[PDB]
């Protein structure tokens, strides 16, 4: 009988905290400064989601999680 | 723990309409023998019951893998003080005397 | 059909036999012909369990027995007679299953 000896790797880890900005500069912008503004995201034509569902952007496969929709040309 | 507050007010409505109850330890299951079909997830409801009866002011009694509870009038006063619902709404349990 | 069966099941012979005799007497008071009791082989519910809660000592086992006796009696009578003879303040343990078939 001995110990478990979970000691060789990772003696201490620091928590992963997201530097989420309180100001919507990276998230949304108007670039117009007017009452009527344009939106920098593609209109979703799917009717399995809501009418206010806006997707973000990555290098590909805009990862919504709920639907896993990826734009492909068939 | 890891308990929401809408589930908290739902379980407080359940305690107000129920009062005296018997419980069975069931957490990991998706289907309970006698406390399912409440349109609310079972795990959080049972942890809500755990909070109610282990906050440190209402005593418990566990044997034969079951929970029988003696809801003290201190609990009645606590619920009245927090949720501010007058006790003039008598519980429906006082029929068939 | 007027054929009715009564299954009396209990763990002891005394109460079961007394109930069977009383039921047969009540049926026989009426000018009714009734089939004699049939005795099932009394299936035995053996359970063997180690005596010691720990795993120490000589290997000793409790042999627990639960003996279930069951009897069937056949007769021909309408439902009212059966349900009037049933409510006779039966002694505890003699479970009754009355069937029409």
């Amino acid at each position: 009988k001995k110990r478990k000896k979970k000691s060789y790797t990772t003696p201490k880890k620091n928590k992963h905290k997201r530097k989420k900005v309180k100001l919507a500069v990276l998230k949304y912008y108007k670039v117009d400064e007017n009452g009527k503004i344009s939106r920098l995201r593609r209109e979703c034509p799917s009717d399995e989601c809501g009418a206010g569902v806006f997707m973000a952007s990555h290098f590909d496969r805009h990862y919504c999680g709920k639907c896993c929709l990826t734009y492909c040309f068939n | 723990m890891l308990m929401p507050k809408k589930n908290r007010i739902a379980i407080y409505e359940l305690l107000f309409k129920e009062g005296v109850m018997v419980a069975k330890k069931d957490v990991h299951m998706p289907k309970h023998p006698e406390l399912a079909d409440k349109n609310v997830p079972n795990l959080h409801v049972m942890k809500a019951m755990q909070s109610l009866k282990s906050r440190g002011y209402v005593k418990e009694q566990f044997a034969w893998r079951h929970f029988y509870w003696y809801l003290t009038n201190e609990g009645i006063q606590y619920l009245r003080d927090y949720l501010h619902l007058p006790p003039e709404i008598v519980p429906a349990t006082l029929r068939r005397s | 059909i007027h054929r009715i069966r009564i299954t009396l099941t209990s763990r002891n012979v005394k109460s079961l036999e007394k109930v069977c005799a009383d039921l047969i007497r009540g049926a026989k008071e009426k000018n009714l012909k009734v089939k004699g009791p049939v005795r099932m082989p009394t299936k035995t519910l053996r359970i063997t369990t180690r005596k010691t809660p720990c795993g120490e000592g000589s290997k000793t086992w409790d042999r627990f027995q639960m003996r279930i006796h069951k009897r069937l009696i056949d007769l021909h009578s309408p439902s009212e007679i059966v349900k009037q003879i049933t409510s006779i303040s039966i002694e505890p343990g003699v479970e009754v299953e009355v069937t029409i078939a």
Partner: protein, 55 residues
């Protein structure tokens, strides 16, 4: 998310699906005839259930 993990491969011999109905003991279960106890608990209550030492 939750449904992405649960119910992936059926556990058709789940040992943890049973426990002693009196003290919640994992070992020595008595499932015969539906007692579903650790054998110690059964010995504690065997005379009350109806099981008796005759032989």
């Amino acid at each position: 998310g939750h449904q992405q993990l649960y119910w992936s491969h059926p556990r058709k011999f789940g040992q943890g699906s049973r426990s002693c109905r009196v003290c919640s003991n994992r070992h020595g279960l008595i499932r015969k005839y539906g007692l579903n106890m650790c054998r110690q608990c059964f010995r504690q209550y065997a005379k009350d259930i109806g099981f008796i030492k005759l032989d």
